[PDB]
Ligand binder design. Structure first.
Ligand SMILES: Cc1cc2nc3c(=O)[nH]c(=O)nc-3n(C[C@H](O)[C@H](O)[C@H](O)COP(=O)(O)OP(=O)(O)OC[C@H]3O[C@@H](n4cnc5c(N)ncnc54)[C@H](O)[C@@H]3O)c2cc1C
Ligand code: HEM
Ligand code: HEM
Ligand code: HEM
Ligand code: HEM
Ligand SMILES: O=C(O)/C=C/C(=O)O
Ligand code: NA
Length: 568
């Protein structure tokens, strides 16, 4: 057979997969996927038949209920979503190579006739609020608005939920929590505010940073009440004390928080539509929001009538052409992001009248794995790892801020460096076991043996670790002034991870006020239009601090949902 439907129709009727009238159930293909599951079993049952020692297409780190049609189309060949970041050895029936080819919002002007027909029709649905994007900001705003009394529709352009938030590792910053008190830490919302303004070179909007620090404990309390575990508290650069919260043992904060938000949306019966892209905000004759035009992958263009629209579409760090226009030094670099993080949400905001700010400030994460092409969290360094070059020596403060770590790594022999750690560091952060499972953390019982494996001067490496352990013991790093020295590297075996920089977060974006209301260039509010998360500018300023982005999306996402509900 040439395709999957042709294969099944050799011994099955069309209604084995389709509804009685033959029409597609909706853009999420809910009915059709239910039939795949009735015969083959759930994703977890299918995964028992496709095991590999260290990977499995049907059992991954993605949260929520991943639909079979995310990767298996029926009437045409299709792509494996995992190939957008990894290169595993797979053999999916009727596959084709991964290629992302999505028209820009400007290119969709080509569909004038279909768009005009949709807008002349009655609205397909009439609700109070529409939320655009299924990352942390978007789920937070849909749950908040629903709990306040509003009827919502939440849309997502990709086949799977969670955006870049499902990948988060290091933690969520907050201050003066009960979680901190149980680990004997002393902090305050005022210290969190001060660290954040210094971190962004005092370019941040102080009104927005006051919302970020003052609502942080409440945001941790809200997530925990919905079922989250945010009890492990670690350190990341730029923080005066430990304040990055994550699940017990040091697991990743992102897949866990997105799973808790999805389960709470399902409990509240929130209308969630996959494969549905927001295209154009609609306004009445007085310039206030009246609804939004969307494009369903399977059902076509239609529009939804509503009092408010909340844009929660994330950043543009995967779009290297747009990145290079703003910062030529980043042209050609790899990215840490999901395939759809390209900035189409900003284009929708701008067409509606919103102004942008701080677009030139773009962060390249210093440590992506050379072998695996994926981010290695700053928490590996925060829990104690060091960085060495091919000469076997230290060369930078590993928890330094701004762009100092990426610049220092690019200046070393080969334009890359190595993270070095032991079994005490490994046992302190469970996320490290995920890098060992991927095959990117070679190990040996001595530093001389490990250097011989990876091309690092082994005798100099041994001396370098002995010296660093001496500075940990005395309590001061006189070589590079690293301000936190949590453990000596001296238990069990040693590990190395080869790293280099990659494009990661866009700190600029749409202008918002303290109520998450979008504004134009004259600072006038556009009634009914809201923005929250990485699509906004002004929270982080000229440089970001690790752990502040997840704090931002929960706080500003919940706030926008409450405000849009009251406005409606
Ligand atoms: C690998 C990785 C690890 C990270 N780790 C951390 C961490 O530990 N701590 C931290 O503070 N930050 C971390 N960050 C940053 C933080 O996760 C992001 O800034 C956060 O994902 C922003 O969330 P958001 O809700 O604004 O957007 P996202 O989570 O990116 O979600 C946006 C969603 O909107 C959808 N969308 C876009 N345009 C449209 C459209 N037109 N119509 C419909 N849907 C659309 C997208 O497809 C996407 O699913 C990390 C980032 C990455 C990439
Ligand atoms: C989109 C919906 C479905 C998906 C994604 C799916 C998935 C698959 C795949 C990938 C194969 C292997 C093809 C090959 O070897 O070339 C397969 C085969 C098969 N499918 Fe499906 N399927 C779907 C619907 C169904 C339904 C509704 C039924 C039963 C009525 C069914 C029964 C079978 C059977 C019997 C086989 C052959 C092997 C076996 O005995 O399991 N499938 N399916
Ligand atoms: C001769 C038998 C079939 C007929 C006439 C038929 C008809 C159609 C039509 C007309 C569409 C497109 C609808 C639109 O664009 O609005 C479609 C899509 C689809 N059909 Fe079928 N179908 C048949 C068999 C199957 C089988 C056996 C399966 C599953 C194994 C299946 C699953 C799907 C799915 C998942 C879609 C969405 C798009 C895609 O994945 O290709 N159909 N079908
Ligand atoms: C309940 C949901 C799904 C069903 C029922 C389904 C069905 C199947 C079946 C029947 C096979 C062939 C297995 C064999 O007999 O060897 C298969 C293979 C495969 N499917 Fe799925 N699939 C589902 C979801 C997905 C998703 C969401 C993805 C990607 C994220 C995916 C990617 C693959 C790949 C990559 C293979 C080949 C695996 C390998 O070579 O180890 N499938 N699927
Ligand atoms: C269903 C699709 C995918 C599968 C089956 C898969 C599989 C894996 C596996 C086997 C690992 C090693 C650790 C573990 O066992 O969990 C891993 C790690 C990782 N993957 Fe994926 N992957 C998928 C999609 C993606 C995509 C699309 C991205 C990026 C947008 C991504 C980013 C990462 C990262 C950053 C890690 C490092 C460890 C961590 O942060 O937990 N993966 N993946
Ligand atoms: O885990 C990380 O290093 C990413 C942190 C962040 O972007 O805040
Ligand atoms: Na931003």
């Amino acid at each position: 057979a040439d395709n999957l439907a042709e294969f099944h129709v050799q011994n099955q009727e069309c209604d084995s997969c389709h509804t009685p009238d033959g029409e597609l159930s909706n853009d999420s293909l809910t009915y059709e996927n239910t039939q795949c599951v009735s015969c083959h079993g759930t994703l977890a049952e299918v995964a028992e038949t496709t095991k590999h020692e260290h990977y499995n297409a049907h059992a991954s780190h993605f949260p929520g209920e991943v639909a079979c049609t995310s990767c298996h189309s029926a009437h045409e060949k299709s792509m494996v979503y995992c190939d957008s970041c990894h290169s595993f050895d797979f053999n999916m029936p009727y596959a084709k190579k991964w290629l992302r080819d999505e028209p820009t919002i400007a290119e969709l002007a080509k569909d004038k006739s279909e768009r005009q027909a949709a807008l002349a029709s009655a609205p397909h649905d009439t609700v109070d609020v529409v939320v655009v994007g299924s990352g942390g900001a978007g789920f937070s705003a849909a749950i908040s608005a629903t709990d306040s009394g509003a009827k919502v529709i939440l849309i997502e352009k990709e086949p799977v939920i969670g955006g870049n938030a499902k990948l988060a590792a290091g933690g969520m910053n907050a201050a003066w929590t009960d979680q901190q008190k149980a680990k004997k830490i002393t902090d305050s919302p005022e210290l969190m505010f001060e660290d954040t303004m210094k971190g962004g070179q005092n370019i941040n909007d102080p009104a927005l940073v006051k919302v970020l620090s003052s609502h942080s404990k409440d945001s941790v309390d809200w997530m925990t009440a919905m079922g989250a575990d945010l009890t492990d508290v670690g350190m990341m650069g730029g923080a005066s004390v430990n304040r990055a919260h994550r699940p017990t043992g040091g697991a990743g904060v992102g897949a866990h928080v997105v799973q808790v938000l999805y389960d709470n949306a399902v409990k509240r019966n929130i209308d969630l539509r996959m494969n549905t892209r927001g295209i154009e905000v609609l306004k009445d004759d007085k310039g206030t929001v009246k609804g939004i035009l969307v494009k369903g992958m399977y059902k076509g263009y239609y529009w939804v009538k509503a009092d408010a629209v909340i844009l929660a579409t994330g950043g543009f760090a995967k779009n290297n052409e747009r990145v290079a226009k703003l910062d030529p030094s980043l042209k050609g670099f790899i990215s840490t992001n999901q395939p759809g993080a390209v900035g189409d949400g900003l284009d929708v905001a701008e067409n509606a009248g919103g102004a942008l700010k701080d677009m030139q400030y773009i962060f390249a994460h210093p440590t992506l794995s050379v072998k695996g092409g994926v981010m290695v969290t700053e928490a590996v360094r925060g829990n104690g790892a060091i960085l060495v070059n091919r000469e076997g020596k230290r060369f930078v403060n590993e928890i330094t801020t701004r762009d100092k770590a990426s610049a220092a790594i690019l200046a070393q022999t080969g334009k890359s460096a190595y993270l070095i750690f032991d079994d005490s560091v490994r046992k302190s952060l469970s996320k490290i076991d995920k890098y060992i499972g991927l095959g990117v953390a070679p190990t040996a019982d001595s530093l001389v043996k490990l250097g011989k494996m990876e091309g690092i001067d082994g005798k100099a490496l041994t001396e370098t670790v002995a010296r660093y352990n001496s500075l940990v013991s005395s309590g001061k790093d006189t070589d590079f002034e690293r301000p936190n020295l949590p453990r000596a590297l001296n238990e069990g075996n040693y590990y190395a991870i080869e790293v280099t920089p990659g494009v990661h977060h866009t700190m600029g974006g749409v202008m918002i006020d303290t109520k998450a209301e979008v504004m134009n260039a004259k600072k006038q509010v556009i009634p009914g239009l809201y923005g929250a998360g990485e699509v906004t500018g002004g929270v982080h300023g000229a440089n970001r601090l690790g752990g502040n982005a997840i704090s931002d999306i929960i706080t500003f996402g919940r706030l926008a949902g409450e405000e849009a509900a009251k406005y409606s």
